[PDB]
Every structure is written in structure tokens, then in C-alpha cells.
């Protein structure tokens, strides 16, 4: 009874630690390799920068604040800290599939106009595009929240908000269409609809240039595709949620909720495809 709490305590403090730390100690590494690599320090780099930013935040805030939640069985954070942790959650979302977005626009704008790509992008733009998706993200998931958009009237729902020890995400159902279609869905259809464009374009394309451009294409395709593997469960059943519970158990939900902040450990290992990545992530752990 209490010995079965403590090992399972104990266990996943530890399962949870570890996670806390490939996503911390992988994200460093990609945003120190770019900082101190001038050959890594081209404009779609800084997008990637942005990324795991976004990434470095889900292990320092969102990850710790749920491992105390799995953990311990309750919510040991008082209100307001529900409500930010909340909101950290949906931002870092929206910003990563946004800047997924920009990431598959630059490429596509690189490989059919080269040359006024050449003259349009520049630093001040790149970050002048990147301050503007986390103002959107920033917008689009902050409001809604603080100012309590996302509540239910449900006797349930009243039940966790009276109690300061639960921070379940109880959502109304226009809440959790809405954010879903304006943090998800729209600019998951847009990557896509671009992603393929430019995977079209690249087969309409010395050779050995061609090859090593292609090979950085499909890094950046297989990070789309990952981040659409671990979020898109998700958000499916986010969405059948609201129409009938019972369709999808619950423990599920939150595992996929899980699934979703797992994603933030797997770029920087993904950029282990690069020789370059590579070389300043081994000259960086010295
Ligand atoms: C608790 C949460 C809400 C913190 C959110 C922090 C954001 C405001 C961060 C996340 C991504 C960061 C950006 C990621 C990348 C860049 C590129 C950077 O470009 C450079 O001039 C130097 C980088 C290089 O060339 O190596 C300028 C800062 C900026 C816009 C950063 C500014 C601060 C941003 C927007
Ligand atoms: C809230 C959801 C439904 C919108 C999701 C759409 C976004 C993922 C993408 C689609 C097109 C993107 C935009 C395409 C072009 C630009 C221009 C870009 O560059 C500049 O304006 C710099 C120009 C300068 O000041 O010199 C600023 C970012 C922005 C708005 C991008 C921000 C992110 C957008 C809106
Ligand atoms: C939760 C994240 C929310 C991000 C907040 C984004 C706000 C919009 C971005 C913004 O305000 N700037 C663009 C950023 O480049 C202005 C900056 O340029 C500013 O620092 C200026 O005061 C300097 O340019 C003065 O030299
Ligand atoms: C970008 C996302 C922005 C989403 C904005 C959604 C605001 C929707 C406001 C709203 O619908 N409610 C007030 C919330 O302020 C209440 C109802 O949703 C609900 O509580 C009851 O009427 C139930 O009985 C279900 O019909
Ligand atoms: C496109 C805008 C249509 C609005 C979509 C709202 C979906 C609400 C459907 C719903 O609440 N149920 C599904 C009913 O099939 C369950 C109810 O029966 C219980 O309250
Ligand atoms: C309170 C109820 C929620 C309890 C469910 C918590 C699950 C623990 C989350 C976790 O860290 N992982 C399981 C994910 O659920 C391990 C991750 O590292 C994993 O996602 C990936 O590395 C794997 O997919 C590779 O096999
Ligand atoms: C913070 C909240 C709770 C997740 C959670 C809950 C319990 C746990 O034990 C572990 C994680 N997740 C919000 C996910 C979300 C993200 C983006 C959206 O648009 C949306 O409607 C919902
Ligand atoms: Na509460």
C-alpha cells in the first residue's frame, strides 16, 4: 500500500529526471553549437535556435511542473502557477509548429527564387520573423487563459477549480475545438501543403552540392514529421473528446499529452544526421 506508493515514487522521479535531462542537456548543446559555429550560423539555423528555445522551455518549466503532478498524485503549486504552467504548455506548442512553418516557407522561397531569396533574407528579417511567431504564439495562447476563456460550467469541471490541488486542463468544448484549430491545426495543413511543394521542387533538381543540400532537407522533413507523429494523437483526441468521452480512455490522453512533451528530447538527436552538428556537439562535450 505505502511501500507500493514509495517504489513507484521514487521510479518515476527518476524516469522523469532523466527526461528533464536529455531535453535540457540536447537543447544546450544545439543552441551553443550554433552560437559558437560560424558555419553553423546561416538565417534557417536561427530558426532552428528558435525551436529549441521552444524545446528548452518544455524541459526547465513544463516537464518539472507535470513530473511534481505524476508524481506526487496532485497539484502542490497554488493557482496562479496552474494557470502560467498552463499557459507555457500551449505557447511552446504553437510557437514550435509555427516556426515549423516559417523553417518549410524559407526553404521553399530558397528553392524556386534563389536570388531573391539572396536580396529578401536577411539577419534583421530572420529575426523580425522570429519575434512575430512567438508575438502570435504568445497571443493566441496566453489571453484565452488568463483571461478564462477556456472554463466549463460541468460539476466536475467547478470541482478542480475549487480545488488547489488540481490542475487539470477541464476545458469547454469551444475552447479545445478553437485552440486546437488556431495552435494546430491550420498551421499543421499549412506545413504540410509547403512541405510537399518543396519536396516537389527538390526532385525537379556538383552533384555532390545537390546531395549534401538534399540530405540537410530530409533532417529538416524527418523533424516535421516526428513532431506530426508525437502531437497529432493528441490533438486527434482532443478533439473526438468533445464529442464523446468514452471513444478513447482516459489514461491515453495524458499519455499522449506525454507523448507531445517527449518530442522536445528528439531534435537534437536528430541533428546528429550532420556531420557538422556532430563535430560541435563532440568539440562542445570535450
Ligand atoms: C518564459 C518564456 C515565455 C520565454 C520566451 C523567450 C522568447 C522571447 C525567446 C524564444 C526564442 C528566442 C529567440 C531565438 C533566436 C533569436 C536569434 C538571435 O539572432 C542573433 O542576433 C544571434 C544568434 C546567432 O546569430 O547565432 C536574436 C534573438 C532571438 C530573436 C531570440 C529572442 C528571444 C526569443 C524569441
Ligand atoms: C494563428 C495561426 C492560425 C496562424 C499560423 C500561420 C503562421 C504559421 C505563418 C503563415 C505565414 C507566416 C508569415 C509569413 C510572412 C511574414 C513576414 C515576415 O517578415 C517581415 O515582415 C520583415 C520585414 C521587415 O520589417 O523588413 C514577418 C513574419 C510573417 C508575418 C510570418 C509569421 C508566421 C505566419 C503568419
Ligand atoms: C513570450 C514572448 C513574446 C514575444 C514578444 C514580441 C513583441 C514584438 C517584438 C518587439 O517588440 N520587437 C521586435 C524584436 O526584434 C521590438 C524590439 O526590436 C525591441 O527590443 C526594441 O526596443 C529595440 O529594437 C530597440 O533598439
Ligand atoms: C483561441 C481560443 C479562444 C476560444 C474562445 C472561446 C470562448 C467561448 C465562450 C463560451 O462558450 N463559454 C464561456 C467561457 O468564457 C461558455 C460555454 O462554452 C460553456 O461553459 C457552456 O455554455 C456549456 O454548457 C457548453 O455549451
Ligand atoms: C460545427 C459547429 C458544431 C458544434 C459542435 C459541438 C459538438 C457538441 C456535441 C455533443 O456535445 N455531443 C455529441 C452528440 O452527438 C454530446 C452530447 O450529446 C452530450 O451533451
Ligand atoms: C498521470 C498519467 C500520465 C502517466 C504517463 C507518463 C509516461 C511517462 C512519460 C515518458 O517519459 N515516457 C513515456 C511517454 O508516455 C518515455 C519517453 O521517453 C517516450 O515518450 C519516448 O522516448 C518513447 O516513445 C521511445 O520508446
Ligand atoms: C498543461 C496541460 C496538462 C497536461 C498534463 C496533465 C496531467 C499530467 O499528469 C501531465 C500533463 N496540457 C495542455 C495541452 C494543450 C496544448 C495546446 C492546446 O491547444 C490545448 O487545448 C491543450
Ligand atoms: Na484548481
Given at each position: 500500500?505505502?511501500?507500493?506508493?514509495?517504489?513507484?515514487?521514487?521510479?518515476?522521479?527518476?524516469?522523469?529526471?532523466?527526461?528533464?535531462?536529455?531535453?535540457?542537456?540536447?537543447?544546450?548543446?544545439?543552441?551553443?553549437?550554433?552560437?559558437?559555429?560560424?558555419?553553423?550560423?546561416?538565417?534557417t539555423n536561427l530558426f532552428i535556435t528558435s525551436l529549441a528555445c521552444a524545446d528548452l522551455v518544455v524541459g526547465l518549466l513544463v516537464?518539472?511542473?507535470?513530473?511534481?503532478?505524476?508524481?506526487?498524485?496532485?497539484?502542490?503549486?497554488?493557482?496562479?502557477?496552474?494557470?502560467?504552467?498552463?499557459?507555457?504548455?500551449?505557447?511552446?506548442?504553437?510557437?514550435?509548429?509555427?516556426?515549423?512553418?516559417?523553417?518549410?516557407?524559407?526553404?521553399?522561397?530558397?528553392?524556386?527564387?534563389?536570388?531573391?531569396?539572396?536580396?529578401?533574407?536577411?539577419?534583421?528579417?530572420?529575426?523580425?520573423?522570429?519575434?512575430?511567431?512567438?508575438?502570435?504564439?504568445?497571443?493566441?495562447?496566453?489571453?484565452?487563459?488568463?483571461?478564462?476563456?477556456?472554463?466549463?460550467?460541468?460539476?466536475?469541471?467547478?470541482?478542480?477549480?475549487?480545488?488547489?490541488?488540481?490542475?487539470?486542463?477541464?476545458?469547454?468544448?469551444?475552447?479545445?475545438?478553437?485552440?486546437?484549430?488556431?495552435?494546430?491545426?491550420?498551421?499543421?495543413?499549412?506545413?504540410?501543403?509547403?512541405?510537399?511543394?518543396?519536396?516537389?521542387?527538390?526532385?525537379?533538381?556538383?552533384?555532390?552540392?545537390?546531395?549534401?543540400?538534399?540530405?540537410?532537407?530530409?533532417?529538416?522533413?524527418?523533424?516535421?514529421?516526428?513532431?506530426?507523429?508525437?502531437?497529432?494523437?493528441?490533438?486527434?483526441?482532443?478533439?473526438?473528446?468533445?464529442?464523446?468521452?468514452?471513444?478513447?480512455?482516459?489514461?491515453?490522453?495524458?499519455?499522449?499529452?506525454?507523448?507531445?512533451?517527449?518530442?522536445?528530447?528528439?531534435?537534437?538527436?536528430?541533428?546528429?544526421?550532420?556531420?557538422?552538428?556532430?563535430?560541435?556537439?563532440?568539440?562542445?562535450?570535450?
Amino acid at each position: 500500500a505505502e511501500l507500493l506508493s514509495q517504489q513507484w515514487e521514487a521510479g518515476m522521479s527518476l524516469l522523469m529526471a532523466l527526461v528533464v535531462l536529455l531535453i535540457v542537456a540536447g537543447n544546450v548543446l544545439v543552441i551553443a553549437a550554433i552560437g559558437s559555429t560560424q558555419r553553423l550560423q546561416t538565417l534557417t539555423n536561427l530558426f532552428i535556435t528558435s525551436l529549441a528555445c521552444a524545446d528548452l522551455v518544455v524541459g526547465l518549466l513544463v516537464v518539472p511542473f507535470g513530473a511534481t503532478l505524476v508524481v506526487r498524485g496532485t497539484w502542490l503549486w497554488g493557482s496562479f502557477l496552474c494557470e502560467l504552467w498552463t499557459s507555457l504548455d500551449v505557447l511552446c506548442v504553437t510557437a514550435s509548429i509555427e516556426t515549423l512553418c516559417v523553417i518549410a516557407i524559407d526553404r521553399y522561397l530558397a528553392i524556386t527564387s534563389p536570388f531573391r531569396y539572396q536580396s529578401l533574407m536577411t539577419r534583421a528579417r530572420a529575426k523580425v520573423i522570429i519575434c512575430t511567431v512567438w508575438a502570435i504564439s504568445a497571443l493566441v495562447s496566453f489571453l484565452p487563459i488568463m483571461m478564462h476563456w477556456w472554463r466549463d460550467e460541468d460539476p466536475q469541471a467547478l470541482k478542480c477549480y475549487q480545488d488547489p490541488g488540481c490542475c487539470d486542463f477541464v476545458t469547454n468544448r469551444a475552447y479545445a475545438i478553437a485552440s486546437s484549430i488556431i495552435s494546430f491545426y491550420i498551421p499543421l495543413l499549412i506545413m504540410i501543403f509547403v512541405a510537399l511543394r518543396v519536396y516537389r521542387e527538390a526532385k525537379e533538381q556538383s552533384r555532390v552540392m545537390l546531395m549534401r543540400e538534399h540530405k540537410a532537407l530530409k533532417t529538416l522533413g524527418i523533424i516535421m514529421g516526428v513532431f506530426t507523429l508525437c502531437w497529432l494523437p493528441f490533438f486527434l483526441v482532443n478533439i473526438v473528446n468533445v464529442f464523446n468521452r468514452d471513444l478513447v480512455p482516459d489514461w491515453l490522453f495524458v499519455a499522449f499529452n506525454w507523448l507531445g512533451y517527449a518530442n522536445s528530447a528528439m531534435n537534437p538527436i536528430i541533428y546528429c544526421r550532420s556531420p557538422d552538428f556532430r563535430k560541435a556537439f563532440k568539440r562542445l562535450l570535450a
